[PDB]
């Protein structure tokens, strides 16, 4: 019975998964970005109110 | 972002000039209407783009 | 109630047409104040305005 390969998963890890891993590094970068951007609208929020 | 934007948009409305308030007495034949501006005199004036 | 009710439906079409005419007409608004010999007046009139009195 059955039909599966284990060869395929391992291959997918070296090849395809590494390119997804570059993309997850970018979402890290996004994380950092929206700290500075949050602080900035906070400065502007005060300036508007004045 | 929503909050800062609104506080600035209400300020923009203040800076741009006043409004008044009339009542349409009749319709005239150039696609203008005879308004009586309630606290002042009459002015004959063009329709809007929504009216 | 046949003698008037049959034919009444026909009149209601006529009332509807009387509604349709007034709006159809009111859609078209144009001027001119005065006549053709006073169309000459404006060509002059432009000038007499730019002058102050």
From Swiss-Prot, chain A:
Q: What the entry says about post-translational processing?
A: N-acetylated by NAT3.
In terms of superkingdom, the source organism counts as Eukaryota
Localization per record: Cytoplasm; Nucleus
The family classification in the record reads: Belongs to the AAA ATPase family.
Its function, per the record, reads:
The 26S proteasome is involved in the ATP-dependent degradation of ubiquitinated proteins. The regulatory (or ATPase) complex confers ATP dependency and substrate specificity to the 26S complex.
The protein here is known as 26S proteasome regulatory subunit 6B homolog
Swiss-Prot record, chain B:
Function as written in the Swiss-Prot or TrEMBL entry: The 26S proteasome is involved in the ATP-dependent degradation of ubiquitinated proteins. The regulatory (or ATPase) complex confers ATP dependency and substrate specificity to the 26S complex.
Q: What is this protein called?
A: 26S proteasome regulatory subunit 8 homolog
Q: Which domain of life, per UniProt?
A: Eukaryota
- Compartments, as annotated in UniProt: Cytoplasm; Nucleus
* Species in which this protein is naturally found: Saccharomyces cerevisiae (strain ATCC 204508 / S288c)
Q: Report the gene name.
A: RPT6
Q: Record's family?
A: Belongs to the AAA ATPase family.
Mention any additional remark: Present with 4700 molecules/cell in log phase SD medium.
Q: How does it assemble?
A: May form a homodimer or a heterodimer with a related family member. Interacts with OLA1, TMA17, and UBR1.
Record PTM text: N-acetylated by NAT1.
Swiss-Prot record, chain C:
Query: Domain of life of the organism in this record?
Result: Eukaryota
Describe how it is modified after translation.
Answer: The N-terminus is blocked.
* Localization of this protein: Cytoplasm; Nucleus
Q: Which family does it belong to?
A: Belongs to the AAA ATPase family.
On subunit structure and binding partners, the annotation says:
Interacts with UBR1 and CIC1.
What is this protein's function? The 26S proteasome is involved in the ATP-dependent degradation of ubiquitinated proteins. The regulatory (or ATPase) complex confers ATP dependency and substrate specificity to the 26S complex.
Further remark: Present with 105 molecules/cell in log phase SD medium.
What's the protein called, per UniProt? 26S proteasome regulatory subunit 7 homolog
Provide the gene name from the record.
Answer: RPT1
Interval of the full protein contained in this chain: 42 to 94 of 467
């Amino acid at each position: 019975n059955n039909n599966s390969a284990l060869s395929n998963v391992n291959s997918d890890i070296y090849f395809k998964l590494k390119k997804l891993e570059k993309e997850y590094e970018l979402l890290t970068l996004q994380e950092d970005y929206i700290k500075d951007e949050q602080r900035h609208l906070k400065r502007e929020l005060k300036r508007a109110q004045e | 972002n929503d909050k800062v934007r609104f506080i600035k948009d209400e300020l923009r409305l203040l800076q741009e000039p006043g409004s008044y308030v009339g009542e349409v007495i009749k319709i005239v034949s150039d696609k203008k209407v005879l308004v009586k501006v309630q606290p002042e005199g009459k002015y004959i004036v063009d329709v809007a783009k929504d009216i | 109630a046949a003698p008037y009710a049959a034919k009444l439906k026909q009149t209601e079409n006529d009332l509807k047409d009387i509604e349709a005419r007034i709006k159809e007409k009111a859609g078209v608004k144009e001027s001119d104040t005065g006549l053709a010999p006073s169309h000459l007046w404006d060509i002059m009139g432009d000038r007499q305005r730019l002058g102050e009195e």
